[PDB]
Amino acid sequence: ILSVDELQNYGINASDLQKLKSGGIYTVNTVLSTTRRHLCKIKGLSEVKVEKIKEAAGKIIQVGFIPATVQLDIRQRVYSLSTGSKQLDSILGGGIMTMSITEVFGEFRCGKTQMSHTLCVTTQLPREMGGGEGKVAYIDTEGTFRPERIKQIAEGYELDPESCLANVSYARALNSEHQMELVEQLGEELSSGDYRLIVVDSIMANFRVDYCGRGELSERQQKLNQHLFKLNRLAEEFNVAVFLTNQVQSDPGASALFASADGRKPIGGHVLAHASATRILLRKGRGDERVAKLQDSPDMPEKECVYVIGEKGITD
Amino acid sequence: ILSVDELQNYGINASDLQKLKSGGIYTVNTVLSTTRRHLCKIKGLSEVKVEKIKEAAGKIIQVGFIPATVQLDIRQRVYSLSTGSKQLDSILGGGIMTMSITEVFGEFRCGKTQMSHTLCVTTQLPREMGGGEGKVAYIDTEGTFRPERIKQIAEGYELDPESCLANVSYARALNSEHQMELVEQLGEELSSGDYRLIVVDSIMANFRVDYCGRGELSERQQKLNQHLFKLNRLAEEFNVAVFLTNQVQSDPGASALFASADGRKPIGGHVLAHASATRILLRKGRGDERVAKLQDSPDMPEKECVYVIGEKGITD
Amino acid sequence: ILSVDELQNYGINASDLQKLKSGGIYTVNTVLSTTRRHLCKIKGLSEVKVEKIKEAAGKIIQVGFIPATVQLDIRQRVYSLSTGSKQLDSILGGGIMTMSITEVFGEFRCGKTQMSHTLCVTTQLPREMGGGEGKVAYIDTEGTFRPERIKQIAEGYELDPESCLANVSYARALNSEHQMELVEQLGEELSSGDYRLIVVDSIMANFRVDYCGRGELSERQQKLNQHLFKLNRLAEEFNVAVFLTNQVQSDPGASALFASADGRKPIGGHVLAHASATRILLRKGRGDERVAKLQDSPDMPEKECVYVIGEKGITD
DNA sequence: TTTTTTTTT
DNA sequence: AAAAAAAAA
Ligand SMILES: Nc1ncnc2c1ncn2[C@@H]1O[C@H](COP(=O)(O)OP(=O)(O)OP(=O)(O)O)[C@@H](O)[C@H]1O
Ligand SMILES: Nc1ncnc2c1ncn2[C@@H]1O[C@H](COP(=O)(O)OP(=O)(O)OP(=O)(O)O)[C@@H](O)[C@H]1O
Ligand SMILES: Nc1ncnc2c1ncn2[C@@H]1O[C@H](COP(=O)(O)OP(=O)(O)OP(=O)(O)O)[C@@H](O)[C@H]1O
Ligand SMILES: [Mg+2]
Ligand SMILES: [Mg+2]
Ligand SMILES: [Mg+2]
Three-state secondary structure string covering B295-316: EECCCCCCCEEEEEEECCEEEC
Distances (CA, A) of B243 to A63, A145, A154, B200, C212: 56, 19, 31, 6, 38
% helix, strand, coil for chain C, step of 5? 35, 20, 40
Closest residue to A108, CB basis, from B67, B100, B273: B273
Q: Which residues contact A69 (CB under 8 A, 6 or more apart)?
A: none
Bridge partners, A198 (sequence order): A137, A242
Which of A73, A104, A114, A39 shows the shortest CA–CA distance to A241? A104
Kindly report the nearest CA distance between residue A277 and chain B, in angstroms: 24
Kindly report the nearest CA distance between residue B222 and chain C, in angstroms: 16
Asked if the Cβ–Cβ distance from A107 to B270 is below 8 Å, we say yes
**Cα B229 versus chain centre, distance:** 10
Nearest residue, CA→C1' of E5:
C215
Asked if the Cβ–Cβ distance from B36 to A177 is below 8 Å, we say yes
Asked if the Cβ–Cβ distance from A113 to B253 is below 8 Å, we say no
Q: Which residues contact A230 (CB under 8 A, 6 or more apart)?
A: A180, A183, A184
Tally of CA atoms within 13 A in the half-sphere of C125 that contains its CB: 22
Task: Please say whether the beta carbons of B197 and B234 come within 8 A.
Answer: no
Asked if the Cβ–Cβ distance from A208 to B217 is below 8 Å, we say no
* φ and ψ of A194, to 5 deg: -125, 85
Residues of chain A with C-beta less than 8 angstroms from the C-beta of B222:
212-213
Which of C33, C27, C65 shows the shortest CA–CA distance to C233? C33
CA dist., res. C240 & res. C102, Å (int): 11
% helix, strand, coil for chain B, step of 5? 35, 20, 40
Which of C219, C274, C35 shows the shortest CA–CA distance to B213? C219
Q: How far is the CA of C101 from the centre of ligand 2 (A)?
A: 14
Peptide bond into B145 cis (omega under 30): no
CA dist., res. C103 & res. C242, Å (int): 8
* φ and ψ of B60, to 5 deg: -70, -55
Query: Atom 31 in ligand 2: which residue has the minimum CA distance?
Result: C301
- Tally the residues of chain C: 316
CA dist., res. B244 & res. B267, Å (int): 13
A26 CA – D2 C1', rounded, Å? 39
CA dist., res. B127 & res. B123, Å (int): 9
Q: How was this structure determined?
A: cryo-EM
Of all nucleotides, the one whose C1′ comes closest to residue A217's CA is: D1
**What pairing do the DSSP bridges indicate for beta strands C289-296 and C278-286?**
antiparallel
Q: Touching check for C67 and chain B: CB below 8 Å?
A: yes
Answer for B225: CB within 7 Å of strand D: yes
Q: How far is the CA of A183 from the centre of ligand 4 (A)?
A: 21
CA dist., res. C6 & res. B312, Å (int): 45
Strand E: positions under 7 A of a protein C-beta atom:
1-9
Residues of chain B with C-beta less than 8 angstroms from the C-beta of A189:
65
C15 CA – E2 C1', rounded, Å? 58
CA dist., res. B234 & res. B148, Å (int): 29
Is C in contact with B (3 or more beta carbon pairs below 8 Å)?
yes
Q: What is the SS3 assignment for C293? A: strand
Bridge partners, C199 (sequence order): C138, C243
Which of A194, A74, A193 shows the shortest CA–CA distance to A127? A194
Of ligand 3's listed atoms, the one at least distance from the Cα of C108 is 25
Residues of chain B with C-beta less than 8 angstroms from the C-beta of C301:
309-311
Strand D-proximal residues of A, range 11-50, CB below 7 A, are: none
Q: Which residues contact A151 (CB under 8 A, 6 or more apart)?
A: A161, A164, A165
What's the one-letter identity of residue A141? T
Strand D: positions under 7 A of a protein C-beta atom:
1-9
Query: Atom 8 in ligand 1: which residue has the minimum CA distance?
Result: B301
Of all nucleotides, the one whose C1′ comes closest to residue A209's CA is: D2
Q: Which residues contact B68 (CB under 8 A, 6 or more apart)?
A: A138, A147, A150, A165, A166, A167, A168, A169, A170
Q: In chain B, positions 271-290, which contact chain C (CB-CB < 8 Å)?
A: 288
Q: Touching check for B146 and chain C: CB below 8 Å?
A: yes
* φ and ψ of C161, to 5 deg: -55, -55
CA dist., res. B269 & res. B273, Å (int): 7
Which of B49, B78, B21 shows the shortest CA–CA distance to B197? B78
Q: What is the DSSP string of A285-300?
A: EETTEEEEEEEE-SS-
Q: Which residues contact B94 (CB under 8 A, 6 or more apart)?
A: B80, B82, B130
Ordered alpha helix ranges (H), chain A: 17-22, 29-32, 36-39, 48-60, 69-74, 86-91, 114-122, 147-156, 161-167, 176-189, 207-210, 217-237, 269-275
Resolution (A): 3.4
DSSP H or E stretch at residue C268? none
Task: Please say whether the beta carbons of C86 and C121 come within 8 A.
Answer: no
Query: Atom 10 in ligand 1: which residue has the minimum CA distance?
Result: B301
Residues of chain C with C-beta less than 8 angstroms from the C-beta of B168:
67-68
Handedness of CA A212, A213, A215, A217 (dihedral sign): positive
Distances (CA, A) of A6 to A36, A57, B238, B310: 20, 9, 47, 74
Long-range Cβ contacts of C175-179 (<8 Å, 24+ apart)? C175/C206, C175/C210, C176/C206, C176/C207, C176/C209, C176/C210, C176/C211, C176/C223, C177/C210, C179/C139, C179/C141, C179/C206, C179/C227
Q: What is the SS3 assignment for B53? A: helix
**Cα C77 versus chain centre, distance:** 17
Closest residue to A171, CB basis, from B32, B65, B233: B65
Asked if the Cβ–Cβ distance from C68 to B147 is below 8 Å, we say yes
Between helix A147-156 and helix A114-122 the angle, nearest 10°, is 50
What's the one-letter identity of residue B64? G
Which of A117, A58, A108 shows the shortest CA–CA distance to A83? A117
Which of C25, C60, C63 shows the shortest CA–CA distance to C45? C25
Q: What is the DSSP string of B208-265?
A: HHHS-STTSHHHHHHHHHHHHHHHHHHHHHTT-EEEEEE-B----S-S-SSS---S--
Which of A194, A277, A183, A280 shows the shortest CA–CA distance to A234? A183
Q: Which residues contact C107 (CB under 8 A, 6 or more apart)?
A: C248, C263, C283, C284
Kindly report the nearest CA distance between residue B10 and chain C, in angstroms: 33
Ligand nearest to the CA of A117: 1
Which of A115, A64, C268, C275 shows the shortest CA–CA distance to B247? C275
Distances (CA, A) of C205 to B211, C145, C252, C295: 25, 15, 21, 22
Asked if the Cβ–Cβ distance from B299 to A210 is below 8 Å, we say no
DSSP H or E stretch at residue B46? none
Asked if the Cβ–Cβ distance from B214 to A148 is below 8 Å, we say no
Q: Touching check for B252 and chain A: CB below 8 Å?
A: no
* φ and ψ of C288, to 5 deg: -120, 35
Q: Touching check for B210 and chain A: CB below 8 Å?
A: no
Q: Which residues contact A55 (CB under 8 A, 6 or more apart)?
A: none
Task: Please say whether the beta carbons of B200 and B242 come within 8 A.
Answer: yes
Distances (CA, A) of C224 to B73, C34, C206: 51, 18, 10
Answer for A52: CB within 7 Å of strand D: no
**What pairing do the DSSP bridges indicate for beta strands B304-310 and B168-172?**
unpaired
CA dist., res. A89 & res. A292, Å (int): 11
A:B CB pairs within 8 Å: 112
CA dist., res. A179 & res. A170, Å (int): 13
Task: Please say whether the beta carbons of C119 and C145 come within 8 A.
Answer: no
